[model samples]
Target chain A: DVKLVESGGGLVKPGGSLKLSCAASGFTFSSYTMSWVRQTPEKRLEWVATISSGGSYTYYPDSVKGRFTISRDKAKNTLYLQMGSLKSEDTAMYYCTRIGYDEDYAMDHWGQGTSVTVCSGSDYEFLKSWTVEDLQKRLLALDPMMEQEIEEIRQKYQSKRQPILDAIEAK
Target chain B: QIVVTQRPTTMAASPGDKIIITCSVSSIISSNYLHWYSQKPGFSPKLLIYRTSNLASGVPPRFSGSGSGTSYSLTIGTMEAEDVATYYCQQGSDIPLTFGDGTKLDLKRGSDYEFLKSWTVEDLQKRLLALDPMMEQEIEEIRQKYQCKRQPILDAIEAK
Candidate 1:
């Protein structure tokens, strides 16, 4: 049987870290492999990477390697995904999944999915990107959803200033 | 990006009936990557197609599909009682696989599909009784457990 058991929700802040899990129930966890995919609340989806049963042989698609890792505890029938140096871009639904087969490739099973938010914190510092290996090694550290009211600030931003910024950058 | 939709969120039928599901995308999902899936209650979705019309290995041929560009057809040539489940259309031509909202198939009447011997409501009741062991709980638990148990195995096999 194919299975992907995952936590449903969690929370974290920028520059911090968090760990999420997807556990298998019926299928032989050893024979199967687990992968992670991302779904931003506002976007469709993104493929992150795949990992073996022992948290080894992880494959991060070239696009998502900077801040994602796939690891697991085979005995527990569980797989884990970690994101680091979190950024607003990292806030999205992350799924621990497995692929089924046909004459070609396909996705068969998925976990309940865990949603992690990388938001602005009370601290003054902004989150800076971290190295790939460093983020992968300390997954247990990074980490929801809340909408609140903030004063609407409006200024008569200049259209002529935009062209200048664009021209300078293009040059 | 092609967006796909399934109609009549839920459809009822008897055993030996015929069920047709239409998958319409905003734009052509490309002939090569359109696919279909069946998400039985509490179970992971199963791939019914790939490379357009080709059926997955071990999938029942009765579950056939056709169409191209922005429209497609997934037909249960002869629906069995066991065919009662939710079906979804998927597109893999792009990033992060996308799935349809799902259309569920259920029993109607005058149906006598032998495979349904496995879906007897009483059997489901017995299974429900076993899970709660008290008989006072709702059937949803049994439904969920059944899905959890089969989805993965189905997924592993579907991966084949």
Candidate 2:
């Protein structure tokens, strides 16, 4: 039997800090390790870091160190993670889990994720990025229309070859 | 920290053939909550297993999982071209959202594997920069067009 729980509420501010907890009820916390995972809103889940209940051992990938940290309280059967200098990009549902730390060593047990939000004000909410064509062609004029049309036909003969001779000169 | 790697670079097979994308973690995750993630290219990773054996909601019935303390399997009963792209396994029982490099699976190439752990932004930028003709011109265009800048990353690398 296994269980992991975290406190819930919304987080605000683009660069604020969030501290949450995961408590275990059935199993002895010292018997297992705890890990943190990030589930971005409308996006895929990502691994963050892991720590033992004793707080003596810790592990984090190269990608996570700049933003995350993991800690635990064996006495309370509780684990914690602190997201520092949070950016909107750090906003995501975070999770904690127990480890059997397997041979294939893949993830097997998990906790429900604790959702965290960054940048709460209505004025600060909307974010957007330039589309590929918006940047690559129209603004940069990377591919003019007539040239783009003619370039399409080069497919039949040399499917692998570049069509726009102008690209040769552009290089 | 050590990162486990997957191989074959890729896997492809027709329907009904067996497909396996292996994920070994850096060190051990120490629990059975190892789960499989499927990304159809440009999509977020979805959980396939919880507690090692239980399947997550909406996962295909044909997809079954089995494993012990450290090693596990995400077996596809029948391969479909739609099952193509990449498969990754992450140990939920341990730290830092560790992910296996990745195994790219295609119906024809059932288990095309690649190393996810050894990848970096710098390498990708270099490769794309070499293949394209408009690197310099496009660089200036983006510099003027968008607010995005690589300065922070450059600063970090420079400090290191």
Candidate 3:
């Protein structure tokens, strides 16, 4: 059995950095690949990033490409993920996961998730970067049926940013 | 990017019954790298099958899988109460990996043909009715016990 432990994540303010560490046990750290994932409070799981053991290359989802960085230290049997420019949307339970064997890259082991809460400080700024109209355009590139997912993402972002926008207006 | 979709979003079966779940891909999978997972409520997911049909470590013979190209299937030969979980299929044959939405298996006591084969319908109904309340009570006790063991860990993390 393989085990993973996530260290160092809690409450983070917007415009801050979140760094998490994953410690591996019961397996050769240099022999397998390690990855990072996040599950929203809504229970939607999303793949964040992945890194190979031999330091060959790392992969990241387009949504997190430039904002998330993954690295590993084989000597310490640990993998690290550094996410910067956080937003309230980043508040999620982050998991350190591992993939082994050639058959399935499915994560065979997962660390108990570390709860990272990004407060509502700069959530408005994050939401401003992409408009729901822009998202609609992007969704047009895919199947028309993807409109539902686009709406869901738009609603989630709106909910996260509305309060911050209200607070700013109140000022 | 390939998309994986599982069929029969939900199914029900009785203990000892056989069940089959299917996974379809949008394009050629091109490799025998599909995997299956079982996730019980409130617990982490467990790998049940890997490499299309090969069982994962410690997986029982009752669980099997097979597939090629754009179609795949996972079969559970003898369902147990523990097998009542959401099943997911993931394919690694393409970049930007994806997972099936998942199929949920619900367990219905006495509904299995194999289980009913051994007993008269009346007797089986009686047996299931007799076990229902007892199993509920026992499960409650187990839940409480687990909560007790899990609280300390949650507390320790909060303290940190």
Candidate 4:
């Protein structure tokens, strides 16, 4: 009979931070492990982070490891997902879940979810960090099958102020 | 990284048909660590089975699961229209927990499944069209979002 209530959401800009909270009731706070999961508008539920109810151990998914931090306040029976360095790609619906008592270790309990959006704004920290080379490297790392598309885009932009790596080497 | 894949991305079946959805994992996982979920359109997923074969609380009796090691399955003994949703199998047995690609269940029209809930496609569309004139644009957008998928069935209904 546990219930989870996620805090209201907000819109933030790139280079900023957003914090969402979830409070649980009707169950002993330390009885199970708590976690944060999110779904993009495009519809993939991704695990973000988890924390033991005792606030002893914390775990993060590889993709969100460094960018997000999860914490809990046992006395208040609340969990928090505090993330920084927002980007438009960060827009998503986040939920609070608890590992089930069943042997499967499934997330049987869930919060309704809170929507967060990263709106485009003037201070574009995203672009500052997104050079073509960096983007290409990431594409390859994430999906080597994307080589064809990466190469196609590279050729498309190569003639225009490109040779970014060469320019850096010359300097 | 543990990877999970589901076969037959989409399937069609009539009411009362036995349906089985399989999930294959990249590595062996204990049966107790595999679970199943069903996600309906625009709704949060609901856990259907857990610990391999144990039904989650409130899940219908027709919904069951079985399998072990790297292979697992979710079975519906008597399909229902409300069971039209994408099903996924997930494992929390290891780090980088993974979920299956998902399989969609498409219920055939005209079974006990259809009209069981009393909301027909046309009734829904008409209700949308009857909304405030100011909402027409949004309604149209919503129509475009769903029309491609629903129009064929809707057209068949009109034809009949």
Interface RMSD of each: 25.8, 16.4, 21.9, 25.5
Return the top candidate by DockQ: 2
* TM accuracy, model 4: 0.69
Model 2, DockQ value? 0.08
Report lDDT (Cα) of residue A144, candidate 3. 40
- Residue-level error in angstroms, candidate 3, position B24: 1.3
Error of 4 at B15 (Å): 2.0
Candidate 2 chain A, poorest ten consecutive residues by summed lDDT = A160-169
Error of 3 at A84 (Å): 2.1
lDDT by residue (A20-93, candidate 4, tens digit) is: 99999998877788888787765667778878757888888777777889998888888899988877677787
TM for every model, in the order presented, reads: 0.49, 0.46, 0.65, 0.69
lDDT for each residue of candidate 2 in B5-116, tens digit (9 for 90 to 100) = 5554467666567776555555655445466767654333456766557776678787887766556667888765456656766654533445566677754421222221
**Chain A TM-score, prediction 1:** 0.63
lDDT of 3 by residue, A75-147 (tens): 8998999999886677777888888763458677778767676654332334345655654454354444344
Candidate 3: list runs displaced more than 4 Å.
A42-44, A87-91, A102-104, A121-171, B109-160
| True-vs-predicted CA distance for residue B58, candidate 1, Å | 3.7
lDDT of 1 by residue, A18-87 (tens): 8788878887776765677665544334567776545556676554577767777767777777777776
Ranking of predictions according to TM-score = 4, 3, 1, 2
Instruction: Report the C-alpha lDDT of model 3 over B1-160, residue by residue, as the tens digit.
Output: 6788888998888767899999999987654678888866555567788778877778878898888888999999887655767888887765577778889888664244443455444544444343334334334334333433333333333333
Candidate 2 chain B weakest lDDT stretch, 10 residues: B109-118
TM-score of chain A of each: 0.63, 0.64, 0.68, 0.67
TM-score of 2: 0.46
Question: What lDDT does the true structure give each of the candidates?
Answer: 0.59, 0.56, 0.70, 0.69
Task: Please write out the lDDT profile of model 4 over residues B85-135, one tens digit for every residue.
Answer: 788788888766677767988855422322323544443343223323323
Contacts from the true interface found in each model, as a fraction, amount to 0.06, 0.10, 0.09, 0.15
